Amino acid sequence: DTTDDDKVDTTIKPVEYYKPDGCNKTNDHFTMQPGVNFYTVPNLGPSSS
Amino acid sequence: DTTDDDKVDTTIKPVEYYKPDGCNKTNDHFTMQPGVNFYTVPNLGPSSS
Amino acid sequence: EIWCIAVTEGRKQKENPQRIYAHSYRVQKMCFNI
Amino acid sequence: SADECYTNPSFSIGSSIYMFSQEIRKTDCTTGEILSIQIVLGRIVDKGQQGPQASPLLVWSVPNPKIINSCAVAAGDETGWVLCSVTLTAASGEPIPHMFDGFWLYKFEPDTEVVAYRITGFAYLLDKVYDSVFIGKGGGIQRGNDLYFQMFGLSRNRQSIKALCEHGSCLGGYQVLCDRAVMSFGSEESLISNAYLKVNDVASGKPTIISQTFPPSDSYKGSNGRIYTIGERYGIYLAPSSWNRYLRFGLTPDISVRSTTWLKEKDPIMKVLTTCTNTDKDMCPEICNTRGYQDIFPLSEDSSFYTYIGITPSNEGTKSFVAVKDDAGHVASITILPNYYSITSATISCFMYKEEIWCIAVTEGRKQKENPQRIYAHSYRVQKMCFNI
Amino acid sequence: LKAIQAMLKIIQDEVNSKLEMLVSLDQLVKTEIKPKVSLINTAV
Amino acid sequence: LKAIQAMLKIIQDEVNSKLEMLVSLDQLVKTEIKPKVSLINTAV
Ligand SMILES: *[C@@H]1O[C@H](CO)[C@@H](O)[C@H](O)[C@H]1NC(C)=O
Ligand SMILES: *[C@@H]1O[C@H](CO)[C@@H](O)[C@H](O)[C@H]1NC(C)=O
Ligand SMILES: [Zn+2]
Numbered sequence A, B: 001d002t003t004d005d006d007k008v009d010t011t012i013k014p015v016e017y018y019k020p021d022g023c024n025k026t027n028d029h030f031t032m033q034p035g036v037n038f039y040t041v042p043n044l045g046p047s048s049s
Numbered sequence C: 001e002i003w004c005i006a007v008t009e010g011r012k013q014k015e016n017p018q019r020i021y022a023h024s025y026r027v028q029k030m031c032f033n034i
Numbered sequence D: 001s002a003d004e005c006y007t008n009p010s011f012s013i014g015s016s017i018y019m020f021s022q023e024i025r026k027t028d029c030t031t032g033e034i035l036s037i038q039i040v041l042g043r044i045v046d047k048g049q050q051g052p053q054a055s056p057l058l059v060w061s062v063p064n065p066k067i068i069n070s071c072a073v074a075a076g077d078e079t080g081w082v083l084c085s086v087t088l089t090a091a092s093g094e095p096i097p098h099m100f101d102g103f104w105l106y107k108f109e110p111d112t113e114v115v116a117y118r119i120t121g122f123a124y125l126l127d128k129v130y131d132s133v134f135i136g137k138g139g140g141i142q143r144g145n146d147l148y149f150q151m152f153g154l155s156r157n158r159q160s161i162k163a164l165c166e167h168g169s170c171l172g173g174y175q176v177l178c179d180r181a182v183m184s185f186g187s188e189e190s191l192i193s194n195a196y197l198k199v200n201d202v203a204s205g206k207p208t209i210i211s212q213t214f215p216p217s218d219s220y221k222g223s224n225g226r227i228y229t230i231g232e233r234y235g236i237y238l239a240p241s242s243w244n245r246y247l248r249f250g251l252t253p254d255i256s257v258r259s260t261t262w263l264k265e266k267d268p269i270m271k272v273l274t275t276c277t278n279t280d281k282d283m284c285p286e287i288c289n290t291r292g293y294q295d296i297f298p299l300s301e302d303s304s305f306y307t308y309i310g311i312t313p314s315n316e317g318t319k320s321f322v323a324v325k326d327d328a329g330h331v332a333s334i335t336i337l338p339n340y341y342s343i344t345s346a347t348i349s350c351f352m353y354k355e356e357i358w359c360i361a362v363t364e365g366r367k368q369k370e371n372p373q374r375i376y377a378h379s380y381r382v383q384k385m386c387f388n389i
Numbered sequence E, F: 001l002k003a004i005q006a007m008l009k010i011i012q013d014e015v016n017s018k019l020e021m022l023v024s025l026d027q028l029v030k031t032e033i034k035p036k037v038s039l040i041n042t043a044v
Helices: D173-181 E002-017 E020-043 F002-018 F020-043
Strands: B030-033 C004-010 C021-034 D002-015 D016-027 D034-045 D051-061 D068-075 D080-086 D104-110 D116-120 D130-135 D141-143 D144-154 D185-201 D209-211 D225-230 D233-238 D248-253 D297-299 D308-314 D316-325 D331-336 D345-353 D356-366 D374-382
Touching: C021 F002, D002 D068, D002 D374, D016 D080, D034 D068, D034 D080, D034 D104, D068 D130, D068 D144, D068 D173, D068 D356, D080 D130, D080 D144, D080 D209, D141 D225, D144 D225, D144 D233, D297 D345, D308 D345, D308 D356, E002 E020, E002 F002, E020 F020, F002 F020
Parallel strands: none
Antiparallel strands: B030 C021, C004 C021, D002 D016, D016 D034, D034 D051, D068 D080, D080 D104, D104 D116, D130 D144, D141 D144, D144 D185, D185 D209, D225 D233, D233 D248, D297 D308, D308 D316, D316 D331, D345 D356, D356 D374
16 A cells, blocks of 8 residues: 555556466466557657758 | 557548438438638737737 | 638738738538438 | 835726736835836636636836836737826936826737837827826727727816816805815916827827817816726726715716716715815815725616725724625625735726626735735626515 | 057957847846746646 | 967957857747747646
8 A cells, every 4th residue: 555655656667467367267278468559659769850 | 440559649630521421312412511610720820010 | 520720811900911810610511301 | 125116006808818007116106216117918717716817928018117107008809008108308318207298009919029109299189288198097998999098187278267066065165175176286277187088090000199178167186097898888987186085987978078977876985095084974175185096897888786895994004895886776895805904996897707797806005014015906706686575 | 559459449349249149138038038937837 | 569469369269259159049049949938838
């Protein structure tokens, strides 16, 4: 509860890995896939022409 | 779905023309008309006195 | 929906200098049964 | 700064923009040096507060403030105006107090430079000959391509004086006092009078000025006033300056003297900044000085309803209230500013906001006894009511 | 020697004139910019 | 005496050149910064 008390901005955190929560049954395959969209992130830093 | 992924700002798009979607019946006339209001768009560019 | 912007030259008052103005409107799709 | 005094405020609201002007004098507040004159243009906006809030866009100072008798503002549609009366200067470049040398007119617009015009001897044609001219503090209006302001000053006279002398039951000596009150230094040939001032054809870039004076027979000693717009009609407010301290407000279909008629109401009665001794009941003629200003804002087409702020002197500065007077003569009032030592003046402008009538009052006064004079602004609303007797 | 006196006349005129820009710039920053930066700060 | 004439040549060149920065700076503040500060103020 108190873990974020001293953070100035709480938008993001360090990675907390996914777990097979319930995906442990017979013939049950746990996996990960990328999303379909690939968004732009403008103005990460300065550029020129 | 991915068509807007690389846009910085998605407020407007290029024109996609209207179609007579269902307005193809006997004695059914498809048309277009202007709206009643004519709004101001201030500060399109600099001016002076 | 389709919106349009019109840019025009003119004068607000008779004695004013010429200036450029801009206004916007929309096109409304309509379908009439005769 | 404790050596600076803010006075002679002028405030007017247009469609979305407001004009505000203030003078800064040194120490005296009345006869002290003018250090600067400042004009502010801005908008009235909703900032998530209980009432309407100000938002300055352009702040500008008047050049060569030392040669100005007075300035007043007017506001229209996305534009504002400032009209200043100026005095003569000596060969040394120093101004000569209480003299007249034409007018300056300024035009203000958003995100734009200020345009100045000079109105000189061949541009202004005054009804009579004036030695000194002042522009009414209250401000003026714009109608079409013309501006209307109120003015007063010293007018040369050659006719016999028969001054207006209306009062309540009072114990021809009074007529003599009434005739003397309007004279400057007791000289019959020098009167202090009010007049309308019209600025013609402002859009042409070459404005001219025409005035029209009120005769003594229907006027008291000249004073600060304001021009109002009331639907298709107009109105004029003239502050107390002498023995008559009753409300003086008139209506007219056109900006002219002959067509002007006056209201029969008395409230507010001015009680502050006066040397008069007459009682509020009889208002007997005497020779005295009043230098306050408390205007009103009409809430109906015939000014049968109006809102005003009353001020009364006490042993601890002043006490104040906001009031609305209805067409039956009844007055509803609420006490205001309990934490302020003193308030000496008030000007009121009203507008529609959130589908109801709201008003802003600008006042001069002091928060604490030892403070310098400053200008404050507050807002309130008028609530429509209907009672079954 | 007059060449030197002439040279100083040239130098003085050029410098005294150009430094007018410094006076104007300073007045602008203090009167125009400083005030609105304060207004903007409060707003945000 | 030529030492003095040379000295003035040095002084003039150094000052006249450096003051170009003042002209550029002033143009920048009036053209670039002032306008957007106004735009920002209105927005907020
Ligand atoms: C899977 O995990 C659940 C607990 O969430 C457990 O009850 C169940 O017996 C497990 N099944 C297998 C095959 O591990
Ligand atoms: C109109 O279009 C519809 C499909 O939306 C179609 O079913 C119908 O038969 C068409 N009628 C005519 C006259 O084309
Ligand atoms: Zn009543």
